[PDB]
Design a binder for this molecule. Sequence first.
Ligand SMILES: Nc1ncnc2c1ncn2[C@@H]1O[C@H](COP(=O)(O)OP(=O)(O)OP(=O)(O)O)[C@@H](O)[C@H]1O
Ligand SMILES: Nc1ncnc2c1ncn2[C@@H]1O[C@H](COP(=O)(O)OP(=O)(O)OP(=O)(O)O)[C@@H](O)[C@H]1O
Ligand SMILES: Nc1ncnc2c1ncn2[C@@H]1O[C@H](COP(=O)(O)OP(=O)(O)OP(=O)(O)O)[C@@H](O)[C@H]1O
Ligand SMILES: [Mg+2]
Ligand SMILES: [Mg+2]
Ligand SMILES: [Mg+2]
Lengths: 523, 523, 523
Amino acid sequence: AAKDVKFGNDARVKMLRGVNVLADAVKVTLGPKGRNVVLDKSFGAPTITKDGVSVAREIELEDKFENMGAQMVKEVASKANDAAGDGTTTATVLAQAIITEGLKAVAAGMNPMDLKRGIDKAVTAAVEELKALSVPCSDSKAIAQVGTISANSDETVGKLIAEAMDKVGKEGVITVEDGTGLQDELDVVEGMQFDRGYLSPYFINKPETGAVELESPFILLADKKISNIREMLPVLEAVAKAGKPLLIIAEDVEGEALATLVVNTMRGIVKVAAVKAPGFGDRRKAMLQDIATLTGGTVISEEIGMELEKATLEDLGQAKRVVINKDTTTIIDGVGEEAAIQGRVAQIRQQIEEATSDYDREKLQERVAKLAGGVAVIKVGAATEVEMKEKKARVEAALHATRAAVEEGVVAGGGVALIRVASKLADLRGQNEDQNVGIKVALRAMEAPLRQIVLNCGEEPSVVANTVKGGDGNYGYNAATEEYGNMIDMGILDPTKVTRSALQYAASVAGLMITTECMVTDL
Amino acid sequence: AAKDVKFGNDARVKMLRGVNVLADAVKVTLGPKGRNVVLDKSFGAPTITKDGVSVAREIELEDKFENMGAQMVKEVASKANDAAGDGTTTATVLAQAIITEGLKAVAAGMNPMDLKRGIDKAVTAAVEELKALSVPCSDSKAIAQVGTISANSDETVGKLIAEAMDKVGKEGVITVEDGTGLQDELDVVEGMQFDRGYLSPYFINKPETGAVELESPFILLADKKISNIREMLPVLEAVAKAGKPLLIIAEDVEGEALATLVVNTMRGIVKVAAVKAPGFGDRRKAMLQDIATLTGGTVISEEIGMELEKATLEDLGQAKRVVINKDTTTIIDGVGEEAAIQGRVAQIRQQIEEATSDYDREKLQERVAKLAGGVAVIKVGAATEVEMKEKKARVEAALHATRAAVEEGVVAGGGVALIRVASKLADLRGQNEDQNVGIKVALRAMEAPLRQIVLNCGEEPSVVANTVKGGDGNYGYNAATEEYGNMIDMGILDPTKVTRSALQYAASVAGLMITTECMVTDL
Amino acid sequence: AAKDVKFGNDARVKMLRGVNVLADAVKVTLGPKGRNVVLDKSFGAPTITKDGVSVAREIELEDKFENMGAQMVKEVASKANDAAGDGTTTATVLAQAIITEGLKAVAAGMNPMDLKRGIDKAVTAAVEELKALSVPCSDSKAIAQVGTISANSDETVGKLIAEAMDKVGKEGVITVEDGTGLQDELDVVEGMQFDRGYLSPYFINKPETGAVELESPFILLADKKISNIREMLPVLEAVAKAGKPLLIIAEDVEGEALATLVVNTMRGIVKVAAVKAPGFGDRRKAMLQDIATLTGGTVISEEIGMELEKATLEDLGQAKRVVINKDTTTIIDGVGEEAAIQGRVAQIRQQIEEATSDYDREKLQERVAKLAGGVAVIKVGAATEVEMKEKKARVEAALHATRAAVEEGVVAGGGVALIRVASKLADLRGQNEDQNVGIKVALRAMEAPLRQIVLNCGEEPSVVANTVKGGDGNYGYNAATEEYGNMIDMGILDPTKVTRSALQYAASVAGLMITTECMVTDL
Ligand SMILES: Nc1ncnc2c1ncn2[C@@H]1O[C@H](COP(=O)(O)OP(=O)(O)OP(=O)(O)O)[C@@H](O)[C@H]1O
Ligand SMILES: Nc1ncnc2c1ncn2[C@@H]1O[C@H](COP(=O)(O)OP(=O)(O)OP(=O)(O)O)[C@@H](O)[C@H]1O
Ligand SMILES: Nc1ncnc2c1ncn2[C@@H]1O[C@H](COP(=O)(O)OP(=O)(O)OP(=O)(O)O)[C@@H](O)[C@H]1O
Ligand SMILES: [Mg+2]
Ligand SMILES: [Mg+2]
Ligand SMILES: [Mg+2]
């Protein structure tokens, strides 16, 4: 029908305003200062967002345009957030600065394309500089500091991350679970995780993450792939004479062969999940066996000649809970048998030694390793359930950031890298003036987040920024110290990856926002 | 869509106003003074709330924001109320004071985080002080006084609690039932209670408590777990040739194995409940046997080879009523056989003696103890049914508070502990000024409820508070006396646990309220 | 009309907003930077206004409350403006800062009285510091600079002031007149000034100043006081033939008798003025003689026996123009008799030497001095009449400021004194915290105007202010230099008096605003 059109600046402004609103909350929240943000929920009690990210999520704009603009930033921010594990706010902050400048440039009427290109070019240059700048991660104490950064002055999270990290080992994966109680618990977990996808997003559970968690799942393992429903059905009868979420492991499902019959034919009332059996070939079988032992269930294979129909519920193992993500499917804890698990591990271990070949050894060793799992679980307590969820999310983000940060090594925090790079970046020129301005804009954007921290300090960011820029090498401002010192010496370092990730995303967002001169909507 | 946003103070104010409104009623009601509050009900006759708590429940705010804010307080208050058994109002009162100050501080613009931390710190300090301050509970006369406090000058409740408590014994559990008639009846009850959960909240009955009560329940006991519906079904046929609520006892239900078939397949028209059979192993069987005798029903086990299908309704016992809560499932009174029950008890008792081992003795002794139950039931009469319900609720709260109070021992009432602690607390300083103010705020919050009582007195709380603070040791004001005397000497003591519980919750609430600077809602 | 009564912040808020609006324009204009302001006109092209004072004058607020608030500032500012001659804006700027803070404090709910007291206390302290800080005025080159400051980068004004000042002498009074033409004209004017009041404000001329200027005045001098009209009348009759405006000098004119008859009876179509003859006794006569010679008119005394009636117009002298103010009455230029005037001066001069006594010498010397000194007049040209008026006003202000500045000596400009004093002030504490905050507020207020200049520079005032504060001695920022240097060395100095005056007034204004708890207005 009729469209309400806003031209250029008009289109931009809606996004910009939305961006600003979202950004403002985020910026203040970013850094230790932001205590909290809260807003209502349509259903249920209103959500409260401790984190900057959560704030962005929480914040919705009444205006469609503004909201959409806000959403765009958030979505990018989240993506950066996931990968980096941290720097969600930073990306948002960066984006806002870039966007605003871009918009102004838009006001200038310089073709945004050059600017975008310039920005991208600047980003690339900055990235390169950052990479060189970045240095190896410091020790666990640093790690805690890294954790704290993700923490946003959540001391506990950093401590937990460090503590979990120490026990597990940096290499060892750490998993987070909701705390049993207010006090956190760190437990080594028994179980194995195998990287398998979820066959269909349909399987994908309710939660936003889309990882599916089953409570007291039942595990049916078949070495053979599950061709059709019918074979499955007798299992199902045991299972629809069941209910708490059944997990099914099949070597393969033809999303052709299984899916049509299963979905239509099968009520699927009981929760069901399907995963491909880990590994392939004998190894796959071996993995299945390992899983089966861990589950405590039994596996049925054609070679065995056991029938799925014949197999009862008992054959199916149970898990305390299972979490599945597209990348990987894990069982938090199979009931298993303590002896059984150990025995299998030993047997596999013996096998590992036994096999002459490295390859054989590797498969076995991998298998054994999985069984122990080396997994650590972290529980987060909270005053309230809501808090716990919030805390947990923060913790998870921190963990990812920390892990990434350590491997990458950590660049000086405080946006020191960003400021430092920008200066170098400034010298570089874009192909054309429009590009040049964009490049400058990007540089400006980088500078801003340093200022924001300063603003939180209440110190005038101009002086700090100037001083920071002036200092060669790694120079930065420590909010807590409110003294000038080497970032490395300070030991507060922001992860290279997180910084890089955030910057890239922010730049991308900004460019996108910049590009759309005009927006059209239905009236 | 578009959102209506209130920033910071705007967000807070809605909550604050709501809090104040709710709080005001609660505060006045708190203490003997508050005669009553009443408001309409959407359906049915409007509820009338004698109690402060009920007032809060009753009071709803038209404004969503205000209402939500009010709700938040109430929910916390209720939680405190449950645990403490008393002090529901106190928590509310405390919260309001804290919130208001926090809001003002919010107006100050000091970061609430520090304040919250300070408040928490203050709370912790106060708690420690309180614990030291607290002293052992006094005698039953004191108990009645304790009861009266929960009573809010409900003399009857305190008397009933004391009376019930005396007969049952403090240790012995006391249960409350609606009064048969206006006159209360205290009867020792025959029956056993076993701690078992309800399999599903679905089972959970209509009432808010969620405890499920069945009228004239039928009890089917199986030693063996009920794997599937089908085995159940023939029982059901007897029971679908039935209607008034069937209770089912199964050793285990796979919420996998039973649930899918039962729910979908089974109409479940007749009320059904499921509980796991108490105990495990032989003891579980023994417990089942004890239950079976008490029920007067019979239990069927595979070992017996009796069939569930074979078993008739007659095999199933009947109970006058059953109440189930997640923690525990109890049968108020199985029809049982008087002789049978006694005989079983004796047999078990003999067994207890017979067993050499302590362990064997313990299991038997526990079993025997349950059968007698040592249970006492209290009936509350009322002029009207509504009143009775109100009274009953109050009675229950009092009982919990009293029981907790006795074990803990009772601290001086009148908020004496609170005032006393605060002074000590005041000396302690928070890490930072913002924290400091919050700490002070908390202290102020503690003081307030003393004032409220004074206000009810009409005496100027300032003088009283000052005097109370001035007095060392336990110093307090007795409203009734309107004379200064030792709280202990007065013998009016508020339970340590209740006070502690309320304070902690109130603090938590306040912090939460404080945190949310701004609230966003859809327009 | 009706009355609307309000109490509370709301009254304040209106004032604050009004203040800000006026202040903002003024602040930007203040310092060389403020380009301009414009006004509308009902008829003709809209007027355009210049300097900040003019800006403030031009600015009116639609809202009564806001307007009134704005007005209050302006009135005080003008008063300061008059006395200082400069610093109108500064006072306004200071006031705004103070007011806002005070208002915030009002928001705080601290009792403003303490704050006002604290502010006053701070002001006093600051004043003392300033006085000590102040140093003697520099030479004419400095004077021009002083002029420029009043100039607000009006080079011409400063030059004119300096030029006029040089010729006249600093001590010598300089008068400003509208320029004959675009080019300014500086003419020294012969004449004597004697401090005499205007008998009645009725006499007071049209212009706002109320000083009365007569064009080609005729001077009638009577040694005797002019008791009544009748004696005057025959002079007047000649005056009728006259009509060049008549000035009357009488020893004393009783207001009632003369004025009543004169005003009512006499149309007074020709302007008439009356002044008391300068001096008393013989000296008065002598002064009269001196005046008479300077006028070139003759004086009639009873002792002489000359009759006023007898005296013709010729006896009355003429002046090119006369200006009268309440404090003093001056004749810009009597036509005089060249020979007569000179001879008398010589005679007086001889007398001065001649007189043995100091007293005689003093009177004579004073008499000669008045004639000798003469007066200097400055004409200001303009592109347009409107401009000229504006320029003239600015010039006048500058002149006053310069004159004051020179005598006082000039303190470092740039608000350096203000910033410097504040630091010292900060140490001083008010009696009570509320006072303390007010004191701090005042200090903050002082700092602000430095910032404003910086802001105009575009440099971040924070750094500058910090730097300025840090420097001991006279440290300041020169806008033009944009380099740090000694203010004195720079030679840019703001007059002590002007600074002091502005500060005091501003403080007074701020204090006043804070109070006024209740306001009543028409509905
Ligand atoms: N306690 C602290 N002391 C000093 N600097 C800190 C502290 N906490 C964080 N920082 C700095 O502030 C920035 C990190 O804050 P934050 O983690 O909020 O930003 P973010 O990661 O972008 O936001 P989010 O964590 O919500 O994704 C970094 O530059 C970091 O070095
Ligand atoms: N009859 C009484 N005489 C003296 N003081 C009393 C009396 N009844 C109560 N109090 C005091 O008043 C406070 C208890 O009142 P109340 O029980 O209403 O508060 P509450 O427990 O917080 O509210 P609710 O009982 O609704 O949860 C205590 O400090 C108690 O010592
Ligand atoms: N050309 C200039 N270069 C450097 N500083 C200047 C210059 N002109 C003025 N200043 C400084 O700026 C301030 C004076 O500006 P201005 O005269 O506008 O303020 P004001 O006297 O308060 O306003 P008004 O002149 O309208 O009363 C002083 O501190 C003065 O030293
Ligand atoms: Mg972070
Ligand atoms: Mg109570
Ligand atoms: Mg000036």
